[PDB]
Amino acid sequence: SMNPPPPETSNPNKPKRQTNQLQYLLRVVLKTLWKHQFAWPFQQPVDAVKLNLPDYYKIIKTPMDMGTIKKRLENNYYWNAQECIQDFNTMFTNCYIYNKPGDDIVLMAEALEKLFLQKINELPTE
């Protein structure tokens, strides 16, 4: 029983770019979530082996985590802000899908998502 490879943090075939919205996403949006008290289960790829979740990667076929996003932003992996927002959005949704609606993790993701939404209200005009 094995974990999949984590999502790529670089691809030499994918065009790279820095935008003031991607800078804002790293310096502000990601710093804000990363430092949160509820950030810890989302700072890395979901370890199905270590966590005892043999069904996790049968259900969630597009995993994403903030460690992957942070590394993506640091390597200019994204072309635009929408790409990154999407990865964040995937992360949240993944959590919503797999967990029972009253699990603690679900409440944590909701707390991080409302924070996410607040922060991206001040995303610069590109």
**Considering the rule CB under 6 A, would residue 6 count as an interface residue with ligand 08J?**
no
Mask for 70-109, x = binds ligand 08J (CB under 6 A): -------------------------x--xx----xx----
Distance in Å, CB of 58 to ligand 08J, minimum:
13
* SS3 at position 92: helix
Q: Where are the alpha helices (DSSP H) in 12-74?
A: 20-24, 31-34, 56-59, 66-74
DSSP of 61-99: SS---HHHHHHHHHTT--SSHHHHHHHHHHHHHHHHHHS
Indicate which single residue of 7, 24, 42, 88 sits in contact with ligand 08J (rule: CB under 6 A): 42
Can you state the angle between helices 81-98 and 66-74, rounded to 10 degrees?
170
- Name residues contacting ligand 08J, limited to 48-67 (CB under 6 A): 51, 53
User: How far apart are alpha carbons 20 and 18 in whole angstroms?
Assistant: 7
Q: Which residue is nearest to ligand 08J (CB)?
A: 41
Stretch that binds ligand 08J, among 6-14, 41-49, 70-78, 117-125 (CB under 6 A): 41-49
Instruction: Count the Cβ atoms, other than its own, within 10 Å of residue 58.
Output: 10
Distance in Å, CB of 65 to ligand 08J, minimum:
7
> What does the binding site for ligand 08J look like in residue numbers (CB under 6 A)?
41-42, 46, 51, 53, 95, 98-99, 104-105
